[PDB]
């Protein structure tokens, strides 16, 4: 409908956003041959410092796990029995409460401070199509100063074959 406004230079384009187009690495290489295309070219571009939050909603349970870029489980999976809409909201809120100092400890061991001004880059993936899906992601929406969500997607199972289902489901 209406086009977005015009950017005339990259120097203040770096100030308008949290990134820059012109790279400062100055990559000097001579690959005259054709470059190797990625297997999944049409995908979200996942940076190495991005946390994958997985929200699994069920009937009477809602689980929240956080993984790294390489598949390392950061914090253990929170259960309502161990620690509905309000059920998923309180589980996701108390998971994001403890996820911050563990993230600071795991990033300060390598050299990333993450002290002030930098928000945690997050990719949220949901399972279930239940009521706890409503309260969980809202518990991420009030954390906009702490967790910046870039890719909000879902991880929903495609039922390829299935081993078997119980008798009450069929009959």
Partner 1 sequence: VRLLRHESSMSPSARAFSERVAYHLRRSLKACPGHIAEHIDFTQLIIQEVLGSRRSKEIYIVWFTVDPGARFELEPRLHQLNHWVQQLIIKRVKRRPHIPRVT
Partner 2 sequence: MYKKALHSFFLKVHPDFFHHNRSQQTVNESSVARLNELLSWAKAFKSGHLQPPPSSSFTLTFYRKPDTIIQSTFELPSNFAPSDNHRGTVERAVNKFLRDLLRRAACIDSVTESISEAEDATAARAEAKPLRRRGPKSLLDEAVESMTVQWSLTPAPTLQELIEADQILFSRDLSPLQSAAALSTLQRHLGELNYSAWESMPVIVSNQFSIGDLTGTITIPWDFTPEQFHSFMAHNEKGVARCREVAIQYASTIEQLIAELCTALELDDILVSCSHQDALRLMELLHRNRELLIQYGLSKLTLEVGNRHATRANGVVIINCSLTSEQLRPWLKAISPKLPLQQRLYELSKQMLESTLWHLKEFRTMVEPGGVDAFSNDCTYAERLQWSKELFRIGPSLAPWDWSEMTFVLSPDVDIDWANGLLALPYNFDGDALVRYVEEVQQEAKSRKREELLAA
Partner 3 sequence: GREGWLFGQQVQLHYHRFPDEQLITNLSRWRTGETVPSPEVYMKLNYKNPATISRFLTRTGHMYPADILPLNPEAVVKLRVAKAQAIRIGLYPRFGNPFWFRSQKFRPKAYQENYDPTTYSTKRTVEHFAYNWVQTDRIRRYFRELEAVHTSG
Q: Which residues bind partner 1 (CB under 8 A)?
A: 126, 128-131, 133-134, 137-138, 152-154, 156-159, 168-171
- Min. distance of Cβ 153 from partner 1 in angstroms? 6
Helix (H) or strand (E) holding 95: helix 85-108
CB 140 within 8 A of CB 125: no
What's the start-to-end Cα distance of the chain, in Å? Answer: 52
- Tokens standing for residue 55: 């929200």
Mode of pairing for the β-strands spanning 51-57 and 120-127: parallel
Task: Find the shortest distance in angstroms from Cβ 127 to partner 1.
Answer: 10
d(CA 75, CA 82): 14
18: which 2 tokens? Answer: 């949290």
CA distance 81 to 67: 22
Kindly indicate which of the ranges 14-22, 67-75, 98-106, 131-139 contains the residues binding partner 2, using the contact rule CB under 8 A. Answer: 14-22
Return the H-helix or E-strand segment holding 53.
strand 51-57
Q: Choose the contact partner of 39 out of partner 2, partner 1, partner 3, none; CB within 5 to 8 A by kind.
A: partner 3
Rg (CA), the chain: 21
Q: Among residues 59, 141, 150, 153, which is the contact residue for partner 2, using CB under 8 A? A: 150
Mask of contacts with partner 3, 31-50, x by CB under 8 A? Answer: --------xxxx--------
| Residue in this structure with the two tokens 């230079």, named with its chain if needed | 9
Report the partner that residue 47 touches, choosing among partner 2, partner 3, partner 1, none (CB closer than 5 to 8 A by kind): partner 2
Which residues within the stretch 28-57 sit at the binding site for partner 2 (CB under 8 A)? 30-35, 37-38, 41-43, 45, 47
Binding residues (CB under 8 A) for partner 3: these are 1-4, 39-42, 158, 160
Binding residues (CB under 8 A) for partner 2: these are 1, 3-10, 13, 17, 19-23, 26-27, 30-35, 37-38, 41-43, 45, 47, 150
């Amino acid at each position: 409908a209406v086009p977005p406004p015009r950017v005339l230079g990259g120097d203040y384009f770096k100030t308008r956003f949290g990134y820059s187009l012109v790279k400062n690495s100055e990559m000097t290489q001579g690959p005259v041959d054709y470059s190797q295309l990625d297997m999944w070219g049409e995908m979200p571009r996942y940076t190495s410092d991005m946390v994958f939050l997985y929200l699994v909603s069920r009937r009477r349970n809602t689980y929240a796990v956080a993984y790294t870029y390489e598949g390392k489980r950061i914090l253990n999976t929170y259960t309502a029995g161990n620690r509905s809409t309000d059920n998923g909201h309180q589980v996701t809120s108390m998971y994001l409460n403890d996820l911050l100092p563990k993230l600071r400890e795991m990033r300060a061991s390598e050299g990333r401070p993450m002290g002030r001004g930098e928000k945690v880059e997050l990719v949220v993936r949901v399972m279930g199509f239940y009521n706890g899906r409503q309260g969980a992601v809202r518990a991420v929406q009030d954390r906009a100063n702490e967790f910046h969500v870039r890719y909000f997607e879902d991880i929903t199972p495609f039922p390829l074959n299935g081993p078997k289902m119980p008798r009450g489901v069929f009959k």
